[PDB]
Design a protein around this ligand. Structure first.
Ligand SMILES: *[C@@H]1O[C@H](CO)[C@@H](O)[C@H](O)[C@H]1NC(C)=O
Lengths: 42, 48
């Protein structure tokens, strides 16, 4: 029932390198999730 | 005939009896579900 989000930001074909993603937010939203979609600003 | 308006007024007044004065009520109901107990009541003592 917990939605966990880890994030990392880097100022740069994905680059070849190692970077560890630290935790950002942990939320007890608790709903069921099966698919997802993205939003753009245009 | 036989038709009335079921909503009647309480008509509170300061000169009424103890039982005829308005007494606000607040009811709390507690629900426990399949959620990670997001509401809780925690005392912490000073450290040594
Ligand atoms: C959550 O969604 C998935 C969708 O694939 C479903 O199979 C699963 O039974 C759902 N969980 C509950 C508790 O209904």
């Amino acid at each position: 029932g917990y939605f966990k989000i880890y994030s990392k930001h880097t100022p740069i074909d994905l680059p070849q390198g190692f970077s560890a993603l630290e935790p950002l937010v942990d939320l007890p939203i608790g709903i069921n999730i099966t698919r997802f979609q993205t939003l753009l600003a245009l | 005939f036989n038709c009335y308006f079921p909503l009647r007024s309480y008509s509170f007044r300061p000169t009424y009896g103890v039982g005829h004065q308005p007494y606000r009520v607040v009811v709390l109901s507690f629900e426990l579900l399949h959620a990670p107990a997001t509401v809780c009541g925690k005392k912490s003592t000073n450290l040594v």
